[PDB]
Scaffold this active site. Structure first.
Site, short mmCIF file in Angstrom:
data_model
loop_
_atom_site.label_atom_id
_atom_site.label_comp_id
_atom_site.label_asym_id
_atom_site.label_seq_id
_atom_site.Cartn_x
_atom_site.Cartn_y
_atom_site.Cartn_z
NE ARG A 113 -2.40 2.66 3.46
CZ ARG A 113 -3.06 2.93 4.59
NH1 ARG A 113 -3.65 1.95 5.26
NH2 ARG A 113 -3.12 4.18 5.04
CG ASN A 995 -11.40 4.81 9.01
OD1 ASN A 995 -12.26 5.34 8.30
ND2 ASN A 995 -10.23 4.40 8.53
C1 LIG Z 1 -6.95 5.59 7.36
C2 LIG Z 1 -5.86 4.90 8.24
O1 LIG Z 1 -4.86 4.35 7.56
C3 LIG Z 1 -6.29 4.31 9.99
S1 LIG Z 1 -7.86 4.57 10.62
C4 LIG Z 1 -7.28 3.98 12.22
C5 LIG Z 1 -8.49 3.60 13.19
C6 LIG Z 1 -8.36 4.40 14.43
O2 LIG Z 1 -9.29 4.24 15.47
P1 LIG Z 1 -9.66 5.28 16.60
O3 LIG Z 1 -10.42 4.67 17.70
O4 LIG Z 1 -8.38 6.03 16.95
O5 LIG Z 1 -10.58 6.21 15.72
P2 LIG Z 1 -12.04 5.97 15.08
O6 LIG Z 1 -11.85 5.54 13.68
O7 LIG Z 1 -12.76 7.30 15.36
O8 LIG Z 1 -12.61 4.87 15.93
C7 LIG Z 1 -6.23 2.93 12.00
C8 LIG Z 1 -6.03 1.76 12.89
N1 LIG Z 1 -5.48 3.28 10.87
C9 LIG Z 1 -4.65 2.25 10.16
C10 LIG Z 1 -3.22 2.43 10.62
C11 LIG Z 1 -2.49 1.47 11.40
N2 LIG Z 1 -1.11 1.66 11.84
C12 LIG Z 1 -0.42 2.88 11.47
C13 LIG Z 1 0.98 3.16 11.86
N3 LIG Z 1 -1.08 3.83 10.73
C14 LIG Z 1 -2.44 3.66 10.29
N4 LIG Z 1 -2.92 4.66 9.60
S1 SF4 Z 2 -20.56 6.38 13.24
FE1 SF4 Z 2 -18.86 7.95 13.12
S2 SF4 Z 2 -17.15 7.03 14.35
FE2 SF4 Z 2 -18.56 5.32 13.72
S3 SF4 Z 2 -17.84 4.43 11.75
FE3 SF4 Z 2 -19.35 6.09 11.30
S4 SF4 Z 2 -18.08 7.98 10.96
FE4 SF4 Z 2 -16.84 6.46 12.16
#
Ligand SMILES: CC(=O)c1sc(CCOP(=O)(O)OP(=O)(O)O)c(C)[n+]1Cc1cnc(C)nc1N
Ligand code: SF4
Ligand SMILES: CC(=O)c1sc(CCOP(=O)(O)OP(=O)(O)O)c(C)[n+]1Cc1cnc(C)nc1N
Ligand code: SF4
Ligand code: SF4
Ligand SMILES: [Ca+2]
Ligand SMILES: [Mg+2]
Ligand SMILES: [Mg+2]
Lengths: 1231, 116, 235, 58, 118
Positions: A113, A995
């Site tokens: 990726r 996400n």
């Molecule tokens: C788009 C991207 O690559 C995202 S979206 C994110 C989810 C985060 O969850 P959180 O609880 O912090 O927020 P939420 O989505 O509001 O629940 C992850 C795991 N990452 C993948 C990922 C994994 N590991 C690293 C170093 N970088 C990224 N970007």
């Molecule tokens: S409800 Fe909000 S926090 Fe949950 S998956 Fe959708 S955009 Fe993300």
């Protein structure tokens, strides 16, 4: 034995990884997440590996954590694997040098990726794998789903025998998510190829106190170099081992591979060298062109590292005069990309024939690499021979791109049937297509391929499916561009997208719409489509799926109906055969609500087959009058950039269309107006109490409170009903709640919350509201927002402020967006936002939609997403810059006071100086300064005048989810808060990594079901709040909008005004949690989260302690006893109760006990007589001092690590005992 | 396991150069920082005595359980539990569901009753 | 004017990095620790940069944190630098793609040190700088103590005018700790070489709620490739 | 008759500048790399220099 | 057969003791995120932190374990932030054994801690 199976690259590799591994350290990252999740499911299901054991899988806090655990497991003698990509792989690089350096048989499976540079991308290219090419890992690429399986196996077998770790990679999405019918081996078969001798040797050399050794020593210049070279023998043998296993695996599968494989004309003069899924498409084209006499070929690279030239030349035709090396990456400033460089070096060392070598770049971020593009590459070698070119884009800035003639003939094998399906998110199209592939694959000898393109929009998004079926293998690793069958499952698309692009003459087009009559069809169907249908003599079929579904009782659900259309009209299978197979599958699944639901479905199939007749269209359609173009006003940027992108035309946008640094302007979401809500709220003036709570709670800013003066309503539309404004401060004003029906997402939170028993808001069908409200909203938007009439930080007043985050791509009813929207209403015009990657960065900045916007003065949130792991540090740096630059400004202001500057200027300068860190005063004097120094360009005053954007105190905010805050970014967050500087961290806690697909995080609660916590999480929720409160000097608070909007606003004000670090954790509802009655109940759920005691509200304010008061303040009450209903109202808890009632009952009991104890602990804190002091500063003073100055004994060692420019002075090194022991000895020695 | 501060902190600090050097270079800041340290430990010890006197124990849960089997958080959910994004796409995803664009269950039910 | 002095590579470079920077996010790692410590001590002592201000330096929890802070400071319009090597530089790689990708005039001064593989080594070689060669950072090598000073200066001046981040590196110990009698320039002289218009534009395009923009978007296959190639003119 | 080409700017690697420092009489050139990339067909500098010569096509 | 396989696994017979050794720089700063996660896992591991209140090996640089007023590199005028309370933060979990030791004060309490922790 062998086995047929229709699956994707991820599952094909996971199938092998699971069998060959004993341990797996995991972390989620698109698009590799599926492999880890599969492994977890299978382990939970009882699946055994080649050792007859269930896999030992653990989720770490980050990929760096995973890599370290993988290293430990391997060092301790357990076969280990992991799945990752992009940003994740980068974090593993340090441990990769260690894993290869220590010759451990580890295997990394990576979905190649793109890396985030000018922007983030979850799509495929080789930027990530190339970044780890110097780590010492062997690198084996697979170019198809079938190869992912074969190469995954070779990788494991080879790692075990060679003692060199392997990185098996395949293109993200293009291969990882492409579905194909392939053959996989039994686990028993894989087991039989393992080198038992090597495996035993692995166990025996591993760490164990029974026969210990030391690994990871620190070495000097005397031996490090020799130690680095001692592994040479192992690397020299790996290629032969890989070749050996390709052959052994071949004898079991019948599929042969070589380090480098050649395809094409044996006497080809023009040859391409490529890696990954591109090789499949290139071979397809070769088959086509070679059949016409073209002397061309392709060299597929399997083993990228070690790179064996002899094997390369063994695949190279001596007739080749020109060779083009395609690299799926970009290394800025380099003389050439990786593969090209390796190939050039091969020819130079060969020291013989030197054919012309050209370098070409392609497919970055899953950019299409089609036959037409392959044709360009081959034509380039016979023509202009442009070097260091790019293909797939139009580089009108530096002119590096190859022209692409898209009229190129279809190159798919003869007989291949290509299909495209246009669906709406959640309408079941993708599921139906997957079922179709399974069905056809399982009942025919046809090969099957499926690939899906989704939307950045999370709700009401567009999905396009690309399916192919044929008698010959399908190597088309590119989207379908000339379909035999095209289906549009959403009539709304007809008037916005180019649905029939590329459809073959005589092809079939099926449309779902209620336009059965010719008059209606002519009325809704655009001329452009008419045409095409007429000109291409298309078999046009219109089916009212919604009607049939409703009739048979499926409640309007169209999936089963459009599925039948495919089986009957696609032409992939015969009528009777397709029908029974479809009905059989219906009986297969379902069978839950008895034949009640089966019946229905079967009826829908029957009713669909009959209603599916050709639409008799007139020949006049061939010349339907060219429609006009009713277009509204817009920016541009919207017209020239975002509109084209939103219409799926982004690919035609040239390089000159974008900012070299990837920046985008704020507010592009203002013109999207999607109108995808099924139901929207209708305001009922008579019942309204003018409280503004509805606007406050909206997840998309779709509610606009209007407060206008009689004068401002002169040209107001007839139905622009207004009420006399309530409140003494709002006498002669007129109040109105204006519903933005097109931006509304139909979640229902507002109506659910509307206070009056007789709702002032009622959900109604969108079509019954738009005609009247669209013009109303447009008129309301032009009415000045009365921001200076009520307190900005008051419930009602906050909604009389301009919201600076609107119409984002968050799900309908999202629990994160309401919080952020209101934050902008309080500090938006002066805030910086360092946003961690996650949902908030996705709905926050998915190109081309930018929800954040500026106010009427052009001020707005300065938003930025660095990485997932560095949000706090990123914001901290923004804070550092402001400190440095505003300190510079202050220094200049101080200098100005000691000059002949006018008295007025000096007055303002002194005023700004005294209130520089106060948002009100800094702005007051800053604005005076802006006028007084206007036009000043010379001297000291000139410099100050040029710094006007630093005058008013800014608000630095760090936004992030629970995954970021509690896991990966915790170390950074902890450090930033401990710094004591003025930053504000806002954590939207969804209690899961949302996400990425709902993976468990340390913020996930006991008993909640999530990925990697599929039997209910067995550890409690990490108490981030109480951990940070231990510092004593950090403002900490928890909020829950549904419980108290007042407390939330109070918290924002207190946190932001705190002259130190502030942490605010908000309860964010989320689709992943499975709210049983809808996300429209989010506010209610937030309310119960607090009342149940599940989510206690509190504030820890360090300045209260400074005044002899308890800094800890409890804002909610003791648990009311409703936790059980709270939990069971969410599928993340209820699902556990349905599948494992005993454990579930016990786990919910634990949560109730945990929250009972925690609340008592909070009360405990509330009644403490111990207050920790607090002081912003007080001291410093110029000068520094070394910790060793004047020390009685040496304070540094004899190591090169402590050596400094000023070290080297003699000192007592403690080898003669204590001062007293030395004194006593001196006395005893007499003399 | 130890006792309340005995008053020897001053030191204890001055017997180490990392603290003593500051006293010689920045006398005023030093004496204030040492007084701050003495205050910090006084408060922290009181907090530890606080912990030692509490009767709010957290029922320690060893481990075990496991429960052979697992379930997806979206199984049987009334509304969609995953979005239309490529990030949440999985092999088994794709089935139709209520995406929350029509309002709450009750709101939909009420509308139905009002539309008939 | 010119000033003679006997010092090592670290100091010769720090001499320049301090003058040319406003902000520094640091983390200790041999053999580059000296540079950071000197910068901090000089700032504590009140040494002024070319802008007549004391350097704003902060110690982070790791090099990953330092790189993140550097990225934030640059994004917000402050001239920023850091000093690192080996394992430390590896942790900065992710942010390095962001800094170059966003065309920020950051400047990294690294004492080239071996990477821990079969063993850890604090000694000099190019294993670390070669590991970050694909990040998009310009890379300028100095081959002597005297050159460390000169190249450090060129790196800063060039980063400001080009908007492409620079990695100035020299051999760990062999150059970083070797002492030589060299010539250094007064800060005023360095200041006279700075492209004021490039500097002003850097400030102007930086993050600020007074004239905001969005950075770090997420992009689909439709536009990512074009966006990645848009920086060609700068390189 | 011996010489040395000192590399100052490694990235971007400008082939034009490299050749501007290369003596036309050079029969043999050895590229020294102070690193080790296991399995690579050659180390970084060597590969860059090799690409320069192949592209020159002389 | 089975007996042969079992015999070959004798180095796995007795329960091993897994220890993680590190200084304050590691535990309070750079490795904190990983330490926190590992402790939260609930697995049987033992972490022993040798707190020198500074990054010793590298030359005495300040860490978050450095106390208020202590002079160290990057704390040239005495550290102006207090020592991070790593112990109390981890105690918030409730299911992690946490203890502090000081040999000079009590060798007895130290030995008791090792036995109890392990
Ligand atoms: C788009 C991207 O690559 C995202 S979206 C994110 C989810 C985060 O969850 P959180 O609880 O912090 O927020 P939420 O989505 O509001 O629940 C992850 C795991 N990452 C993948 C990922 C994994 N590991 C690293 C170093 N970088 C990224 N970007
Ligand atoms: S409800 Fe909000 S926090 Fe949950 S998956 Fe959708 S955009 Fe993300
Ligand atoms: C040898 C090596 O590269 C050392 S020794 C260690 C000092 C650790 O301090 P701590 O307080 O944890 O322990 P102490 O020395 O007992 O005090 C550092 C900072 N490092 C440098 C360093 C920095 N950053 C990274 C990623 N890796 C390394 N190796
Ligand atoms: S239904 Fe939801 S999105 Fe629509 S106005 Fe109400 S709260 Fe906003
Ligand atoms: S929530 Fe209801 S009563 Fe309150 S302002 Fe909105 S429509 Fe009126
Ligand atoms: Ca604050
Ligand atoms: Mg989350
Ligand atoms: Mg230490």
């Amino acid at each position: 034995g062998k086995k047929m199976m229709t699956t994707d690259g991820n599952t094909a590799t996971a199938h092998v990884a699971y069998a060959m591994s004993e341990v797996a350290a995991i972390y989620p990252i698109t698009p590799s997440s599926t492999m880890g999740e599969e492994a977890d499911d299978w382990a939970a299901q009882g699946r055994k590996n080649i050792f007859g054991q269930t896999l030992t899988i653990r989720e770490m806090q980050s990929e760096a954590g995973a890599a370290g655990a993988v290293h430990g497991a391997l060092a301790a003698g357990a076969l280990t694997t992991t799945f990752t990509a992009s940003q994740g792989l980068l974090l593993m690089i340090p441990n990769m040098y260690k894993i290869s350096g220590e010759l451990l048989p580890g295997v990394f499976h990576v979905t190649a990726r793109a890396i985030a540079a000018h922007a983030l991308s979850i799509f495929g290219d080789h930027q990530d794998i190339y970044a780890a090419r110097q780590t010492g890992f062997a690198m084996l690429a697979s170019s198809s789903v079938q190869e992912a399986h074969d190469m995954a196996l070779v990788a494991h077998l080879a790692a075990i025998e060679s003692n060199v770790p392997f990185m098996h990679f395949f293109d993200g999405f293009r291969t990882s998510h492409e579905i194909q019918k392939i053959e996989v081996l039994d686990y028993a078969d894989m087991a039989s190829l393992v080198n038992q001798k090597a495996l035993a040797e692995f166990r025996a050399k591993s760490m164990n106190p029974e026969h210990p050794h030391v690994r990871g020593t620190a070495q000097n210049p005397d031996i490090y170099f020799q130690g680095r070279e001692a592994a040479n023998p192992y690397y020299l043998k790996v290629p032969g081992i890989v070749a050996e296993y390709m052959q052994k695996v071949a004898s079991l599968t019948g599929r042969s591979y070589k380090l480098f494989d050649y395809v094409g004309a044996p006497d080809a003069e023009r040859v391409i060298v490529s890696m990954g899924s591109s090789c499949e498409t290139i071979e397809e084209v070769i088959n086509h062109l070679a059949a016409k006499g073209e002397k061309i070929g392709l060299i597929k690279v399997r083993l990228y590292r070690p790179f064996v030239s002899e094997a390369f030349f063994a695949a190279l035709p001596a007739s080749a005069k020109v060779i083009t090396v395609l690299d799926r990456t970009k290394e800025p400033g380099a003389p050439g990309d990786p593969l090209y460089l390796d190939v050039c070096s091969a020819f130079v060392e060969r020291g013989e024939a030197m054919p012309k070598i050209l370098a070409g770049r392609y497919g970055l971020g899953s950019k299409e690499f089609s036959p037409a593009m392959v044709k360009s590459v081959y034509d380039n070698m016979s023509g202009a021979k442009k070097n260091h070119f790019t293909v797939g884009i139009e580089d009108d800035v530096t002119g590096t791109s190859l022209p692409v003639d898209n009229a190129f003939a279809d190159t798919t094998p003869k007989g291949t049937i290509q299909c495209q399906f246009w669906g709406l998110g959640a309408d079941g199209t993708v599921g139906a297509n997957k079922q179709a592939i399974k069905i056809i694959g399982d009942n025919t000898d046809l090969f099957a391929q499926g690939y899906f393109s989704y939307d950045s929009k999370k709700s009401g998004g567009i999905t396009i499916s690309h399916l192919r079926f044929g008698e010959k293998p399908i190597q088309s690793t590119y989207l379908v561009n000339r379909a035999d069958y095209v289906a549009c499952h959403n009539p709304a698309y007809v008037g916005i997208y180019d649905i029939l692009e590329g459809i073959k003459d005589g092809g079939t087009f099926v449309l779902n719409s209620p336009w059965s009559s010719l008059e209606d069809m002519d009325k809704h169907l655009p001329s452009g489509i008419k045409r095409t249908i007429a000109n291409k003599k298309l078999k046009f079929y219109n089916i009212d799926a919604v009607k049939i579904a409703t009739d048979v009782g499926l409640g309007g659900r169209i999936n089963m109906i459009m599925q039948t259309a495919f089986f009957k009209l696609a032409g992939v299978l015969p009528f009777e055969k397709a029908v029974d197979l479809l009905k059989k599958s219906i009986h297969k699944a379902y069978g839950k609500k008895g034949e009640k639901i089966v019946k229905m479905n079967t009826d829908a199939v029957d009713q669909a087959v009959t209603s599916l007749q050709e639409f008799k269209y007139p020949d006049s359609w061939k010349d339907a009058p060219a429609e006009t173009k009713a277009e509204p006003m817009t920016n541009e940027f919207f017209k020239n950039v975002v509109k084209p992108i939103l219409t799926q035309q982004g690919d035609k946008l040239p390089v000159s269309a974008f900012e070299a640094d990837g920046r985008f302007p704020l507010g592009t979401s203002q013109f999207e107006k999607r109108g995808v809500a099924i139901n929207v709220p209708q305001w009922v003036p008579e019942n309204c109490i003018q409280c503004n709570q509805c606007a406050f709670v909206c997840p998309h800013s779709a509610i606009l409170p209007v407060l206008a003066k009689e004068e401002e309503l002169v040209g107001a539309p007839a139905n622009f009903t207004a009420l006399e404004a309530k409140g003494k401060e709002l006498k002669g004003y007129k109040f109105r709640i204006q519903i933005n029906t097109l931006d509304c997402m139909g979640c229902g939170n507002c109506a659910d919350i509307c206070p009056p028993k007789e709702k002032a808001l009622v959900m109604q069908p969108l079509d019954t509201q738009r005609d009247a409200q669209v013009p109303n909203l447009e008129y309301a938007a032009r009415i000045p927002v009365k921001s200076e009439v009520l307190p900005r930080d008051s419930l009602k007043g906050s909604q009389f402020q301009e919201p600076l985050m609107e119409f984002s791509g968050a799900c309908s009813g999202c629990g994160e967006t309401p919080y952020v929207r209101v934050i902008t209403q309080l500090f938006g015009e002066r805030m910086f936002i360092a946003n961690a990657t996650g949902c908030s960065s996705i709905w926050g900045a998915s190109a081309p939609s930018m929800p954040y916007k500026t106010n009427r003065l052009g001020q707005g949130p300065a938003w930025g997403n660095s990485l997932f792991e560095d949000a706090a540090e990123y914001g901290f740096g923004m804070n550092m810059s402001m400190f440095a630059r505003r300190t510079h400004l202050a220094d200049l202001a101080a200098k100005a006071l000691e000059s002949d500057a006018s008295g007025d200027v000096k007055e303002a300068l002194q005023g700004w100086l005294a209130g520089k860190n106060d948002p009100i005063k800094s702005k007051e004097y800053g604005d005076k300064l802006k006028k007084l120094l206007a036009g000043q360009k010379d001297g000291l005053l000139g410099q100050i005048a040029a710094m006007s954007d630093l005058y008013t105190k800014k608000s630095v905010w760090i936004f992030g989810g629970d995954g970021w805050a509690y896991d990966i970014g915790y170390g950074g967050l902890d450090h930033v808060l401990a710094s004591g500087e003025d930053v504000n961290v806002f954590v939207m806690d969804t209690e899961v990594y949302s996400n990425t697909g709902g993976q468990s995080s340390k913020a996930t609660p006991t008993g909640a079901v999530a990925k990697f916590a599929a039997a209910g999480k067995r550890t409690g929720k990490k108490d981030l709040a109480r951990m940070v409160m231990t510092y004593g000097y950090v403002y900490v608070a928890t909020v829950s909008m549904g419980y108290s909007k007042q407390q939330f606003l109070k918290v924002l004000k207190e946190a932001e005004s705190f002259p130190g670090p502030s942490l605010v954790i908000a309860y964010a509802t989320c689709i992943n949690q499975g709210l049983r009655k809808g996300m429209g109940k989010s506010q209610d759920v937030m309310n119960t989260a607090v009342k149940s005691g599940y989510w206690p509200l509190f504030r820890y304010d360090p300045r209260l302690a400074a005044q002899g008061k308890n800094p800890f303040q409890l804002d909610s009450k003791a648990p009311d006893g409703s936790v059980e209903e709270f939990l069971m109202a969410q599928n993340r808890f209820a699902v556990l109760d349905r599948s494992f009632p005993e454990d579930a009952k016990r786990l919910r009991a634990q949560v109730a006990h945990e929250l009972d104890v925690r609340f008592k602990e909070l009360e405990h804190m509330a009644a403490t007589n111990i207050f920790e002091s607090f002081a912003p500063a007080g001291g410093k003073a110029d000068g520094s001092v070394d910790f060793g100055e004047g020390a009685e004994f040496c304070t540094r060692d004899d190591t090169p690590m402590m050596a400094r420019p000023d070290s080297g002075e003699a000192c007592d090194q403690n080898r003669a005992g204590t001062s007293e022991q030395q004194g006593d000895l001196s006395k005893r020695t007499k003399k």
